[PDB]
């Protein structure tokens, strides 16, 4: 019937440089640590590879004068299988609104993961590059490198984010109240996010500052429209 979709008129200086192809891929949106605020930028460079996996639907409820008003908290992980992942949380009055709304957050929070080698470099890194630790609430999670072919060794929950981040082999440990799925998943996501901010003897070469896209595309943004 009707066709010729037009939606997503951007609302940001980044939405303009991304909708028009003037920006290549996330690796320059990350290089300047810019904040993504639209749920479509990720759907642009990805989408052909992203998967959504609901982890839990938890009914919480507050006490009210006459009654106990209950809402649902839906934990949704997301990620391709080549080095990106994200995990979002949203609470709402009905179970569909929460699941629809959490996917937008989990997209809006995708981070890059850095996979390294265990013993010798035979192409295509496979496990974490070093020993990483991450906390939330009382939960602590520790991720350790492992030799090729061992497969992830963890509880069922972290063996859903570690797989969707693209890490094949990994050894793990956890401490305190792992039962609470909230803290157990934010702890894992944190220990993954820490992978690119661990300085290693290979990242010692002095850095060469290029120019940010807010400077290189200052013309296209001046002209065209505010």
């Amino acid at each position: 019937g009707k066709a010729e979709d037009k939606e997503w008129l951007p609302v940001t200086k980044l939405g303009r440089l991304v909708k028009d192809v003037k920006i290549k891929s996330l690796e320059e949106i990350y290089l300047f640590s810019l904040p993504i605020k639209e749920s479509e930028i990720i759907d642009f460079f990805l989408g052909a590879a992203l998967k959504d996996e609901v982890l839990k639907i938890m009914p919480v409820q507050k006490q009210t004068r006459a009654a106990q008003r209950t809402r649902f908290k839906a934990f949704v992980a997301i990620g391709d299988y080549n080095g990106h992942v994200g995990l979002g949380v949203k609470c709402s009055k009905e179970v569909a609104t929460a699941i629809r709304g959490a996917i937008i957050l989990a997209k809006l929070s995708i981070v890059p993961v850095r996979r390294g080698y265990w013993g010798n470099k035979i192409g295509k890194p496979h496990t974490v590059p070093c020993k990483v630790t991450g906390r939330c609430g009382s939960v602590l999670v520790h991720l350790i490198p492992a030799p090729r072919g061992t497969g992830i060794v963890s509880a069922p929950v972290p063996k859903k984010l570690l797989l969707m981040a693209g890490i094949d082999d990994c050894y793990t440990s956890a401490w305190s109240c792992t039962a609470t799925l909230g803290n157990f998943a934010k702890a894992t996501f944190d220990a993954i996010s820490k992978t690119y901010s661990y300085l290693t003897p290979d990242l010692w070469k002095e850095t060469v500052f290029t120019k940010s896209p807010y400077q290189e595309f200052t013309d296209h943004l001046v002209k065209t429209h505010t």
Binding site: L34, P35, D219
Partner: protein, 207 residues
Amino acid sequence: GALDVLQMKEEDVLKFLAAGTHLGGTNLDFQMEQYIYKRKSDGIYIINLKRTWEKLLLAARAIVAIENPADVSVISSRNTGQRAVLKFAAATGATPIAGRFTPGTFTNQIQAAFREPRLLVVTDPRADHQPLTEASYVNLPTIALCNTDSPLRYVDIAIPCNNKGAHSVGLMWWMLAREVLRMRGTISREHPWEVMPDLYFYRDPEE
């Protein structure tokens, strides 16, 4: 800046001494300690003016490096600043914000005042804490006119000056508007600018 054509000339020294920008407060920071020269024999500190000049030309070089002039948002909330920043928007193409700031102006894609600058000049870091702690969310450099006692946190180029409410606030903004225009090449150096600083001073009770 190191050369001669950028060194402080003896008439600017007399403007500075007339506005009293060298006069500081009674307190201090452990961060503004390198800008002080000494403390007077009644309890007040004195600001080294050559350091003022060097920090001024550093901020000028930070503003000049922005291609579109229209994203150098200039904020000021207190009265003694408002009139000044409005003239700055006239001098160079910047964008003024004088008055209350309405939290969330930088970080809310829904508000009608949502503007995304690339720099941020601001008077008085202690009375404009809100724009600072909101610049801390979107990678926004900062420039500010501090004092002997102004907390340095989320500011980058601190131009020491009185700014306690004086002719000194207007004088500082005017001199900063002169040096941006000069080194961008829109007016010529060592021909005195036709504008007069008093266009930037505040309305004390009129007449």
